[PDB]
Homo-oligomer: A and B are copies of this chain.
Amino acid sequence: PTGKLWRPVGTSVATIDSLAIVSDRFGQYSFVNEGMRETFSKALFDINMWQPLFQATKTGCGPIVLSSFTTTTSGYVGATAGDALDNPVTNGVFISTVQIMNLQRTIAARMRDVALWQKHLDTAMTMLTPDISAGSASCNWKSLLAFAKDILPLDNLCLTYPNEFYNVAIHRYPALKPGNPDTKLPDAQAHPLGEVAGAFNAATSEVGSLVGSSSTLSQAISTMAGKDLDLIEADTPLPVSVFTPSLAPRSYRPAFIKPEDAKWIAEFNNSSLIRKTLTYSGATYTVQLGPGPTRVIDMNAMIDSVLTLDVSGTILPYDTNPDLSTSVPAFVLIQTSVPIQQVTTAANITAITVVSAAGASAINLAINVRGQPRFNMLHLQATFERETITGIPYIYGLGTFLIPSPTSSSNFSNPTLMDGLLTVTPVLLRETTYKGEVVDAIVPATVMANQTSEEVASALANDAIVLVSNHLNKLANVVGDAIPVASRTDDSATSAIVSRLAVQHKLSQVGQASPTPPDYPLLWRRAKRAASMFVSNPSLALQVGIPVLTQSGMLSALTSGVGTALRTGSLGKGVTDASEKLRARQSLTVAKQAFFDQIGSLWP
């Protein structure tokens, strides 16, 4: 049973609607199922432990028995009259609301009390590493004590109550074994209150540490089910939400990104220059679109973000072409009639809006750093919005210069300030971008081995690629973490892949002389580096031309392997290299024993 306890209203038999929570002035008795007593007992148990320090310091008020907050009522206990009817409990143990209040504020008040002392006990305890993980190692008690008698700073609490803290301590450190009163010798065994827990944390030499290897697994299992690593290369529309894209604002360096390497950025590849004009704040400036191709951020295929083009440390040659100086650098949109990459001359450019200029010309924004005047780090920045560009077939964001007077000097300059580190930040997660279009769902499998070397590094913050990369990255840490894809152990991961290579290379051999019986020693090893190359750089699985990894099978395969692989690790997964791991722990205890030996001499 569970929930609040219920007895019927009218009386006699209890028929649904005849049962109401047995509210009392103190509060409603809620049932205390077996396991929920484990907690409140485990919590109180950790407080009772500090008994010797509560009396010493006259705080506290006696040991807290959980049997002081409960009661022994009986009735039907459920979550609602209907279902509570199927849990007739007799003399169960319930805790009333007003009690659920004290057991709370008591464990809270006492928790402070101890949390404090417990902190002093520690700066003194750990102040001599009472924990080794291979074999033993003593340190003659006299010295030890006479030593901490020093180190411990005058405001601890282990100097005001030595054997009032010691008695608390003995129950937390199975290192300190108190000398028995009637034989005046230790005990071999150490009996700290955490008897079992402390036994099951020792780094057992057979397998690393059960508490470790156990969690590193349940931890990975969490992720595997959580993010949705499963279904990682699913071939079908998936809401961007399914990718929980967060804290995702990637930055670049355009005016370098080739147009074909990333759809969201077209260029004005035209013969001559395209000097246009525009009255901005009265003054008339001339946008240039100089000698080179001047790659500009396209506006369509640009998920309403927060574009913030930073222009700093980048050269600013106002020294040579004086034409450049005087011009306030500024991010400006450019609506063109004919599609760009077909826009020849000025009459082609519909209009030009200065979405964000920089007050003060190019001779205050400068700063000489050895001849080559740089740009004082400043951030121009628009706030592009999907629909502010409705209809408008062609429009481009360009972080240019806005020269107040074009001249012969700036005839080979080309004032694109795009060489600066631009940082787009998708401000509306629901919508992603792929191959130049804005969508609401991705098709994972499509984005695999479909980008090129740099059609990946040139991805646009929160676009399929960047999403089908953030995803693999999780799955990449589940294998990297739990599975042993980094040793000659032909693990579950590199194993799922090997079975694909076989089934694959086996049918490609079917029909024709079949002169080559499948290899296997070579297949195991080829798939080992395939699974390994993945854990290594999760990204690669997106680039066209990557051995194994990019065939449709793998990944879809890998994950579902790694999947079941985590759901069976056992507990002693740590048996892997638990030999050198062990031998390394003994190595430490031998060096730490060496320490105790000095504590033992210096302070005799």
Contact = CB atoms under 8 A, between A and B. Distances in A.
19 contacts: A4-B191, A44-B83, A45-B78, A45-B79, A51-B80, A58-B105, A63-B79, A112-B206, A127-B498, A153-B524, A154-B590, A212-B226, A241-B486, A244-B486, A253-B313, A256-B313, A378-B454, A430-B486, A507-B598
Contacts of A581: 228, 231, 238, 242
A476 B246 contact: yes
Interface in A305-358: 306, 308, 310, 312-313, 315-317, 320-321, 324
A126 interface: yes
Interface in A419-460: 419, 425-430, 441, 444, 453-454, 457-458
Interface string A83-97: 100110000000101
A537 interface: yes
Interface string A1-19: 1111000000000000000
A154 B561 contact: no
Contacts of A79: 45, 48-49, 51, 63, 193
Contacts of A291: 368
Interface in A71-125: 78-80, 82-83, 86-87, 95, 97-98, 100-101, 104-112, 114-116, 118-119, 122-125
Q: How large is the interface on A (under 10, 10 to 19, 20 to 34, 35 or more residues)?
A: 35 or more
B413 A128 contact: no
A384 to B, nearest CB: 13
Contacts of A276: none
Contact of A430 (B107, B368, B428, B487): B487
A538 interface: yes
Interface in A547-587: 552-553, 556-557, 560-565, 567-568, 570-578, 580-581, 583-587
A240 B486 contact: yes
A490 B123 contact: yes
Given A172-B568, A234-B585, 19 more contacts: A2-B42, A3-B45, A4-B191, A23-B191, A46-B570, A100-B199, A116-B575, A122-B568, A129-B557, A151-B520, A212-B225, A215-B226, A239-B577, A248-B537, A256-B312, A306-B540, A370-B419, A374-B419, A425-B537
B241 A487 contact: yes
Contacts of A414: 368-370
B49 A564 contact: no
Contact of A108 (B80, B135, B207): B207
A33 interface: yes
Interface in A143-174: 147, 150-151, 153-155, 159-160, 172-173
